[PDB]
Amino acid sequence: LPNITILATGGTIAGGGDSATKSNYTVGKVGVENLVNAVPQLKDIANVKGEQVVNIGSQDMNDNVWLTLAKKINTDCDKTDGFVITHGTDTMEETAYFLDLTVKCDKPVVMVGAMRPSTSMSADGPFNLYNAVVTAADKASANRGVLVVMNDTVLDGRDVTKTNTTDVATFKSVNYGPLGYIHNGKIDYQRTPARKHTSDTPFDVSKLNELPKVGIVYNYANASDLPAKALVDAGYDGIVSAGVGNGNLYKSVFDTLATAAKTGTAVVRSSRVPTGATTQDAEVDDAKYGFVASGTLNPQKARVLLQLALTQTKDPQQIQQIFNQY
Amino acid sequence: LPNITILATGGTIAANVKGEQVVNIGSQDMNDNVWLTLAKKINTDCDKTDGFVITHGTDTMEETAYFLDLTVKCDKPVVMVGAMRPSTSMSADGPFNLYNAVVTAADKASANRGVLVVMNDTVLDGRDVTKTNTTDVATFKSVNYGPLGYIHNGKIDYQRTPARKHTSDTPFDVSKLNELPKVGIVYNYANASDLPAKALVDAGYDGIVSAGVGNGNLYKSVFDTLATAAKTGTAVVRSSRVPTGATTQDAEVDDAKYGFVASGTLNPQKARVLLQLALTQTKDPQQIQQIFNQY
Amino acid sequence: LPNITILATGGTVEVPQLKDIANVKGEQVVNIGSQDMNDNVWLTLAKKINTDCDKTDGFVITHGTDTMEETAYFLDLTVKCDKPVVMVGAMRPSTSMSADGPFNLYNAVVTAADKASANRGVLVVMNDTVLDGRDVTKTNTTDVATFKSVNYGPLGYIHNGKIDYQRTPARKHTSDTPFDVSKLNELPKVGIVYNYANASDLPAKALVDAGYDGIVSAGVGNGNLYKSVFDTLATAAKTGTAVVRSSRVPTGATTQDAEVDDAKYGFVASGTLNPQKARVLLQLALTQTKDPQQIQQIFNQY
Amino acid sequence: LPNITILATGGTIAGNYTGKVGVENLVNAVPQLKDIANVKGEQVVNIGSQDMNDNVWLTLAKKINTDCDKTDGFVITHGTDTMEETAYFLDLTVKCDKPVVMVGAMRPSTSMSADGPFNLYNAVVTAADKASANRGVLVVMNDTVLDGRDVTKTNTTDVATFKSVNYGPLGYIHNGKIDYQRTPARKHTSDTPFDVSKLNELPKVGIVYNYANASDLPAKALVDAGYDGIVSAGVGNGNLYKSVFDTLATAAKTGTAVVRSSRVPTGATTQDFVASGTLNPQKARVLLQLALTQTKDPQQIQQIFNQY
Ligand SMILES: N[C@@H](CC(=O)O)C(=O)O
Ligand SMILES: N[C@@H](CC(=O)O)C(=O)O
Ligand SMILES: N[C@@H](CC(=O)O)C(=O)O
Ligand SMILES: N[C@@H](CC(=O)O)C(=O)O
C-alpha cells in the first residue's frame, strides 16, 4: 500500500453540531485524528498519517495557510506517495486552484471536504474521505494536477466550483466536466486538464511569505464605485472585476478601473455569471485600456492566478498571456 | 386580437403590437432612474393595453425583472426578453425570442404569474431566473425551482406558478419616489479585504448585501465590519456568490445576535433589489427578515 | 405529534430521531426490489392508502429507487387521499459508509408531518428536496442527488426540518382524477418499445401479437420513430390499439404538431411524460376510454 | 484555405415540418463559408435521421476512409435524432485522423432564428481547425465541440440539446476560434481494432426497455430472431425486470451477447453479462455491434467496452 499524508485545515468535514438533526454547527473543531478514525477502511487502501496544519472554517482561508500548504507539500513530496487535504467547502475551489498553480510535486494531491457536519445524520465526510484516499493512492491520478474529490467524482482544481449552498452534490466542473468517477474504489479516468498545472507553472513560492494584494469588486445595476476606489486608494497590486454578462462593467466602476490600469494596477475582467468564459473581442476592448480577460476563470479563481502572475510580471500583455495558458 | 405594447430599453436584441422606446442603454449600465422610469411607465399605461413585452439587455435582465416583479401593480402580463446574439448575426436568437414573448404576453394563461422572462422557448419567473452562462443562447434558467412553462408552436404548457409574492401582492410603490435607498454589494473570498464594505459604510449606505461564500458565510474581516455596521444601523443581508441554493438561517451564522438578514434563494443582485425596496418601509432587521421570507 | 404511517415495499419495517416529529407506525406491505415493481403492488398500495387515509395524518412509503418515479406517478393519479403521501428510498446501502437512507427517511417524515405538504399530490423526498410525483425522475445511476424534476423543478427544499414550499403541480392529481382502482384487480396491458438507428420492429410486433391494450414508444428526438417501428405501430392503431408517442430523450415534451401526423394514425403525444411515466397514464387512460382524442385530452390534462 | 468536404445525410438542417434540401443548398446559404474554407459537397443520402441505419453507416465509414487523403477535413450534416449514434459509429470505424465533424439543426431552415446556418458555419470552422485533429469524431452544436462518445441529445426541442453529460465538451467556439481544453481518453479512429472496409452487413443488435411490470416479449422476440446481441436499457444501475433477466440469461447461455446499459441518462452501468459503463443503450449498441465483428466471448467483449 502507498503512504498517504492527510493535511488537515478544518471545514465542515471537521465541523460538529449539537444534534444529528439541527443544522446549527461550528466548523473546524474536530482533529485530523478523529476524522481518520471514523473511516477505519482506509487501512485497506493506504497507510495514512495525518498532520493538522490549521483548523479553521475555510471562509477564513487566507494567503498564509495557502503558502503553508504549498511549502509543506513541496517539501515532503519524496517523503510520501501522495496527499489528501481536508478542507472546508466554501473556498475549496480557491485553494485547489492555488495549489494547482504552486505545487511542484506530481504525486497525487487531493482535496476533500463535507457538506454535512461530522455529527450529522447521514454525514457525507466519511465516504468522501475514503474516496479521496482511493484517488490519492491511485497511480493514474498522478500528473493530472491538483484534484478535488467530492460526491464520488474526481474534479480538476482549475474548473471545480461550489454550485449549491447546501447540496452534498455541490461541486461540479461546470465548464469542462470531471476527470473521472469513483465506483467501488476504482476510477475510470477519461479526461485530464490541458492547461498547465503544478510542476509546469513558473510560480515558485518557496521563498514567498506573502502574495500581491488582489481584491474583487462586484458589478450590478447602479453599482457604487466606492469599493473599486477603496482598493485603488489602498494601492492594491491587482483588482478583479466580477462583471455582468461577458465580463462587462458598470460605467462608474469602469471609470475607476480604467484610470487604475493606466497607473499600473493590474485589472482583470472576470464575470459573476457562474459558467462560460469572459472572452476578448466582445463589448470591452481590453488592449485599448490595458485590461485582461479572465477566460473561464470565475472571480475568486482569477484572483488566484492574478496574484501569482504579479510575482512574475506587471505587464498587462504578459498577464493576459498567463491567463491564456493557466 | 389582444393589444400588446413592446417597451424597448436596450440590449443586443436591437396580437396587435404597438412599439415604444423608453430608454436605450446597455443593461450593464442599468440603474435606479431607469427602473423608476420603467415601473412608472408600466403602471401608468397598464389600463391602455392588454400586456407588455420589455426588450432589455441580458447582463442585468434578472435584476430589472425582479424589480418590476416587486413594483408593478398591474396584473396584466409583463414579459421581458433579450438576445445573446447580435441581430445581424447568422442564427440571431432575438427574432424568435421576441415572437415567443409576444405569444406569452397575449396568452390569458400568463396572467397573475408576475413579471416573466421568455428566452429560448421557455417562460421563466422574474424571481428565480438568472444568467448562467456568459455567451450561450440557453443562458437564462430558473436555477432553484425551474421554469413556469414551455412554448411550442405558439402554445404554452404552463405547469408552475410562483408561490412568493409579486406585482399586485407587494406593498412596494415607487410612484411618487424619485430615489431609492443606497444598497451596495461586497464579495467574499479567501483573505478578502474589508475595504469595499468599509467604503460603503463610510459613505453611509442604507444597506449592504454580502455575496458570501457557501451558505452565506463571510471572511472574518468583512464579517467583523458588517457586524459593526449592522449595529450602527446599516442593514446587512447575507447572500451567496454560490449560483444556486438558499442562504439559510440556523447554519454557522447566528443572525439574531448580529442583526443580519438571510437572503434565502435570492442571489446578491436580487437580494439587493428587495433590500432597497424594504428600506423604503422599515429598517428593523427583524421586519426586513419577514420581507425576505415573503418576497 | 402527527400520526404518520410508514408502508414499506423493499428497497436499499420496525432512526430514533423519527420520534421527535411524528408517531410512526409501520407495516410491511410487500418486499421486492423496485426493478421488479408491478401492477399488483401498485393496486395494493393505492387501495391501502385510500382505505386507511382517515386513520392517519399522512403516509411515508419506503421504495427502491430504480422505479420509484413510476410508483410515485401511479399513486399520484390513483390516491384519493389529500393528506401527505411521501415516497423515499436510498441510493447507498444502509450498512454503507455515509449511508443516505437515515437522513432521507428523516426528511420524508418531516414532509409527511408538515400540514403544508397536503394538496400537492404524491411526493418524492430525496436529498433534502421535495419533488412532485409527476416530474420526478432518476437522473444518475449512482449519485445520491440523482432524483430531480427535470422539466419543471422541485416544490420545496428542506432545511433544519423546515420546508420552504415555493411551487405546486398544476396538472391534476389524487382527488381531481377520474381514475378509480378500487374495483380493478388488473390493469390494461401497456408495453414500451425503444427507437434507435436500424431499430428492429420485432419487439413492437410481439406486443401487438399478444394483443396488448396500448404501446408506448420511446422515440428519438421529439417522439420520432424508425420506419419499421412506425409501420408496426400504425398497424396496431388500425386494429384499435392505443399508441402513445414518448421519447428516450431525458427532458422536454413530445409535442403534437411536429413530424408525425398523430390524428391520421390515432397516435397520442406524451408531452413531458417520459416512456415509463407515459405507460402509467395510458394504463389508467384505458380504464376510462379507448378513443385517441379522449386519451390525448388526458395526456394534456394530467 | 483548407479543403473541406461536406457529406449530407439529411435531417432538419435540410428538412410541423418534413431531409429535402440538398447539400449544395445548405452550403450556398452560408456565403461566409467561402472566407474560411474551400467547400466541397456530396449527398450520401437525404433522410430523417430517425430512419438512419447500418447501410448509411457503412457507406459513410467507407467514404471517409477512402477519401481521407483527398481533403483536409469532413463535416457530416445529419439529423439530430440519431446523430449521437452515427458519431460514435464513425468514432470507432473511420481510420482518418483529420477533423470529422457532425452537425445538425433543431429548427427548420425556414424557421426564424433558424440555428442551421451558424451551426454549419461553426462545423466548418471546427473541421478547418487543425487543432481538431486526433480528437476523434466530433459533434459541433450550439457553439460547442463535443466528443462523439459522450455527446447525447438531452432535450427534445432545445437548440442547446447536445451535451457530453458525463465528462463534458472538448472546446468552445468564440468568434471563429476554439479553445480546446480536453480530448477523449478512450481510444478512437485509427486506434481501434475495427475494420468495416469490406463488410456489407453488421451483426444484429437490438434494445429492450425495462420498467415496472415489464413484458419479456420484446427480448424473446430478439432471442427468436437469433440476434448476435441485445442491449438492456435497464433501470437504475443496469438492473433488469425479473422476466426480462430470465430471457436474457437464456439468450446469453445460447450465445447471444448481452450488454447491460441503463435508461438513466447520466452515469455508468458498473461492473460490481457485459456492463456498458457510461455508454447509453444506443451507444452500447454501436460498440457491441462492432465488437461482434471480431469475437463472441462475453469476457473479451467486456474488455472492449473498457477500452473504447
Ligand atoms: N464554514 C464552511 C466553509 C468551510 O469550512 O469551508 C463549512 O462549514 O464548510
Ligand atoms: N451587454 C448588453 C447587450 C446584451 O448582452 O444584450 C446589455 O446587457 O444590454
Ligand atoms: N436497489 C435500489 C434500487 C431498487 O431497489 O429498485 C434501491 O433499493 O433503492
Ligand atoms: N427528425 C429530424 C430531427 C432533427 O433533425 O432535428 C432528424 O433527426 O433527422
**Contact predicate C14/C24, CB 8 Å:** no
Q: Check whether residue A227 and residue A270 sit in a common domain.
A: yes
Q: What is the CATH number of the domain that holds C99?
A: 3.40.50.1170
Dihedral sign, CA of C96, C98, C99, C102? positive
Which one, of A217, A243, A247, A219, lies nearest residue A232 by Cα? A217
The chain D residue lying nearest B83, using CA atoms, is D113
Distance CA B82, CA A9 (A): 45
Which one, of A138, A148, A150, A157, lies nearest residue A198 by Cα? A157
Ligand nearest to the CA of C62: 3
Q: What resolution in angstrom units was achieved for this structure?
A: 1.8
DSSP structure class, residue B264: B
Structural domain count of chain C: 2
Q: Which residues in chain D have Cβ-Cβ distances shorter than 8 Å to A181? A: 166, 267-268
Mutation target for D interface from C43, C66, C71, C201: give the one with most D CBs within 10 A. Answer: C66
**Contact predicate D49/D86, CB 8 Å:** yes
- Tell me how far apart the 2 most distant CA atoms of chain A are, in Å: 59
Run of H or E including A186: strand A186-189
Distance CA C56, CA C62 (A): 17
> CA angle, B278 as apex, B276 and B283 as ends, to 5°?
105
Q: Quickly list DSSP for B109-166.
A: GGTTS-SEEEETTEEEETTTEEE-BSS-TT-EEETTT--SEEEETTEEEE-----S--
Distance CA C76, CA A283 (A): 50
**Contact predicate B126/B174, CB 8 Å:** no
Mutation target for A interface from D145, D163, D174: give the one with most A CBs within 10 A. Answer: D174
**Contact predicate C59/C39, CB 8 Å:** no
The last residue of one of the domains, among D168, D186, D203, is D203
Q: Choose the closest CB to A126 out of C97, C100, C142.
A: C97
Q: Check whether residue B174 and residue B186 sit in a common domain.
A: no
Distance CA B133, CA B140 (A): 8
Give residue D161's Cα distance to chain centre.
15
Which one, of B276, B230, B207, B218, lies nearest residue B64 by Cα? B276
Distance CA D256, CA C177 (A): 45
Coil, strand or helix at B213: strand
The last residue of one of the domains, among D151, D179, D203, is D203
Coil, strand or helix at B238: strand
Instruction: Fill in the amino acid letter for B115.
Output: V
DSSP structure class, residue A6: E
**Contact predicate A246/B57, CB 8 Å:** no
The contacts of residue A215 (CB under 8 Å, 6+ apart) are A227, A231, A236, A238, A239, A240, A303, B192, B193, B195, B196
Cell of C272: 413531458
**Contact predicate D93/D122, CB 8 Å:** no
Q: Check whether residue B276 and residue B231 sit in a common domain.
A: yes
Q: Quickly list DSSP for chain D.
A: --EEEEEEEESTTT------S-HHHHHHT-GGGGGT-EEEEEEEEEE-GGG--HHHHHHHHHHHHHHGGG-SEEEEE--SSSHHHHHHHHHHH----S-EEEE--SS-TTSTT-SHHHHHHHHHHHHH-GGGTTS-SEEEETTEEEETTTEEE-BSS-TT-EEETTT--SEEEETTEEEE-----S--GGGSS---TT-S----EEEEE--TT--SHHHHHHHHTT-SEEEEEEBTTTB--HHHHHHHHHHHHTT-EEEEEESSSBS-B----EE-BT--HHHHHHHHHHHTTT---HHHHHHHHTT-
Indicate whether residue A88 lines ligand 1 (CB < 6 A): yes
Q: Which residues in chain D have Cβ-Cβ distances shorter than 8 Å to B153? A: 16
**Contact predicate A42/A125, CB 8 Å:** no
Q: Choose the closest CB to C255 out of B153, B164, B249.
A: B153
Cell of C204: 413492437
Q: Which residues of B214-225 are buried (b: 16+ CB within 10 A; e: fewer)?
A: bbbbbbebbbeb
Q: Check whether residue D113 and residue D256 sit in a common domain.
A: no
Indicate whether residue A95 lines ligand 1 (CB < 6 A): no
DSSP structure class, residue A178: -
The chain C residue lying nearest B152, using CA atoms, is C255
Distance D217 CA to ligand 3 centre (A): 24
Distance C38 CA to ligand 4 centre (A): 35
Residue D40, Cβ density class (10 Å: 0-12 exposed, 13-18 middle, ≥19 buried): middle
Distance CA A297, CA B134 (A): 12
CB contact under 8 A, D185 and A181: no
The contacts of residue A319 (CB under 8 Å, 6+ apart) are A266, A268, A292, A306, A309, A310, A313
What's the Cα-to-Cα distance from A13 to each of A57, A119, C294, D89, rounded to whole Å?
A: 10, 9, 55, 45
> CA angle, C243 as apex, C239 and C246 as ends, to 5°?
165
The contacts of residue B215 (CB under 8 Å, 6+ apart) are A90, A165, A166, B240, B242, B245, B246, B247, B248, B251, B252
Alpha helices in chain A (DSSP H): 32-38, 63-75, 92-102, 125-137, 226-233, 251-262, 286-289, 299-309, 316-323
Q: Check whether residue D67 and residue D170 sit in a common domain.
A: yes
Pairing of strands A180-183, A238-243: unpaired
Indicate whether residue C283 lines ligand 3 (CB < 6 A): no
Q: Check whether residue A120 and residue A201 sit in a common domain.
A: yes
Give how far C168 is from chain A: nearest CA, Å: 22
What is the residue with the minimal CA distance to atom 7 of ligand 2?
B57
Beta bridge partners of C254: C271
Indicate whether residue C84 lines ligand 3 (CB < 6 A): no
CB contact under 8 A, B163 and C159: no
Q: Check whether residue D4 and residue D73 sit in a common domain.
A: yes
Distance CA B69, CA B54 (A): 13
> CA angle, B197 as apex, B196 and B203 as ends, to 5°?
95
Q: Check whether residue C144 and residue C227 sit in a common domain.
A: no
Distance B138 CA to ligand 2 centre (A): 15
Q: What are phi and psi of A319, to 5 degrees?
A: -65, -50
What is the residue with the minimal CA distance to atom 5 of ligand 2?
B58
Distance CA A326, CA A198 (A): 10
Cell of C291: 378513443
Residue C116: other Cβ atoms inside 10 A: 13
Distance CA A211, CA A197 (A): 19
Q: Quickly list DSSP for C181-238.
A: -TT-SS---EEEEE--TT--SHHHHHHHHTT-SEEEEEEBTTTB--HHHHHHHHHHHH
**Contact predicate A222/B270, CB 8 Å:** no
What's the Cα-to-Cα distance from C268 to each of B157, C194, C300, rounded to whole Å?
A: 16, 16, 10
Subunits with at least 3 CB pairs below 8 A relative to chain A?
Answer: B, C, D
Distance CA B55, CA C129 (A): 35
Range of the domain at C182: 1-188
> CA angle, C33 as apex, C29 and C37 as ends, to 5°?
75
**Contact predicate C262/C245, CB 8 Å:** yes
DSSP structure class, residue A41: G
DSSP structure class, residue B170: S
**Contact predicate A55/A14, CB 8 Å:** yes
Distance CA B157, CA A126 (A): 44
CA atoms within 13 A on the CB side of D130: 2
What's the Cα-to-Cα distance from C166 to each of B46, B104, C130, C175, D229, rounded to whole Å?
A: 28, 22, 10, 22, 48
Q: Check whether residue A194 and residue A251 sit in a common domain.
A: no
Give how far D99 is from chain C: nearest CA, Å: 24
Give how far B141 is from chain C: nearest CA, Å: 11
Distance A87 CA to ligand 1 centre (A): 8
Instruction: Fill in the amino acid letter for B37.
Output: T
Instruction: Fill in the amino acid letter for D189.
Output: T
Beta bridge partners of C125: C130
Distance CA B219, CA B187 (A): 9
Q: Which residues in chain C have Cβ-Cβ distances shorter than 8 Å to B266? A: none
Distance CA A243, CA A263 (A): 21
Which one, of B180, B290, B183, lies nearest residue B229 by Cα? B183
Mutation target for A interface from C103, C142, C146: give the one with most A CBs within 10 A. Answer: C103
Q: Check whether residue B139 and residue B200 sit in a common domain.
A: no
For this PDB entry, the determination method is X-ray
Query: Ligand 3, closest atom to CA C35?
Result: 6
Which one, of A276, A297, A219, lies nearest residue B131 by Cα? A276
Q: Check whether residue A202 and residue A238 sit in a common domain.
A: no
Distance CA B260, CA B249 (A): 10
Q: What is the CATH number of the domain that holds B290?
A: 3.40.50.40
Q: Quickly list DSSP for B14-75.
A: --EEEEEES----GGG--HHHHHHHHHHHHHHGGGSS-EEEE--SSSHHHHHHHHHHH----
Give residue B15's Cα distance to chain centre.
27
CB contact under 8 A, B91 and D30: no
**Contact predicate A113/A128, CB 8 Å:** yes
Q: Choose the closest CB to A23 out of C92, C100, C159.
A: C159
Rg over CA atoms, chain C? 19
Which one, of D89, D122, D129, D90, lies nearest residue D103 by Cα? D122
Q: Which residues of A185-220 are buried (b: 16+ CB within 10 A; e: fewer)?
A: bebbbbbbbbbbbbeebebebeeeeebebbbbbbbb
Cell of B77: 402580463
Q: Choose the closest CB to C98 out of A24, A127, A183.
A: A127
Beta bridge partners of B57: none
Run of H or E including B78: strand B78-81
**Contact predicate C195/C218, CB 8 Å:** yes
Residue D2: other Cβ atoms inside 10 A: 17
CB contact under 8 A, B91 and D111: no
Distance CA D288, CA D192 (A): 14
Which one, of A143, A160, A147, lies nearest residue A300 by Cα? A160
What's the Cα-to-Cα distance from C140 to each of A303, A316, D148, rounded to whole Å?
A: 34, 44, 20
Distance CA D275, CA D285 (A): 12
What's the Cα-to-Cα distance from A10 to each of A91, A172, B255, D135, rounded to whole Å?
A: 12, 21, 23, 41
Rg over CA atoms, chain D? 19
CB contact under 8 A, D167 and A177: yes
Q: Check whether residue C105 and residue C214 sit in a common domain.
A: no
Distance CA B131, CA B141 (A): 7
Strand order in the sheet with A3-10: A47-56, A3-10, A82-86, A109-112, A147-150, A153-156, A180-183, A186-189
Indicate whether residue B9 lines ligand 2 (CB < 6 A): no
Catalytic-labelled residue, pool C12, C111, C254, C272 = C12
**Contact predicate B271/B208, CB 8 Å:** no
Residue the block writes with cell 476606489: A229
Distance B101 CA to ligand 1 centre (A): 42
The last residue of one of the domains, among D203, D227, D250, is D203
**Contact predicate D58/D200, CB 8 Å:** yes
Distance CA B234, CA A292 (A): 35
Which one, of D156, B159, D165, lies nearest residue C252 by Cα? D156
